[PDB]
């Protein structure tokens, strides 16, 4: 691990549009929460019954 590697990685994230600044394992959940369709919104769920 170097400073070069970290600068590179930061650039990679910023470019591909993934998380820029370093985050906790615990906080990344937030991203997950907005990346997805919340469970109660899926057609498999609210539309379940005829």
């Amino acid at each position: 691990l170097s400073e070069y590697a970290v600068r590179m990685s930061r650039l990679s994230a910023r470019l591909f549009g993934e998380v820029a600044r370093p985050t906790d394992s615990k906080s990344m959940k937030v991203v997950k929460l907005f990346s997805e369709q919340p469970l109660a919104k899926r057609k498999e769920t609210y539309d379940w019954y005829p």
């Binding site: 600068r7 930061r10 910023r14």
Partner: peptide
Amino acid sequence: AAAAAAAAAAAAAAAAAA
């Protein structure tokens, strides 16, 4: 620690990205 400046706007307007 180090916070480096990446220009979203420059590459944006240039590549039709904004």
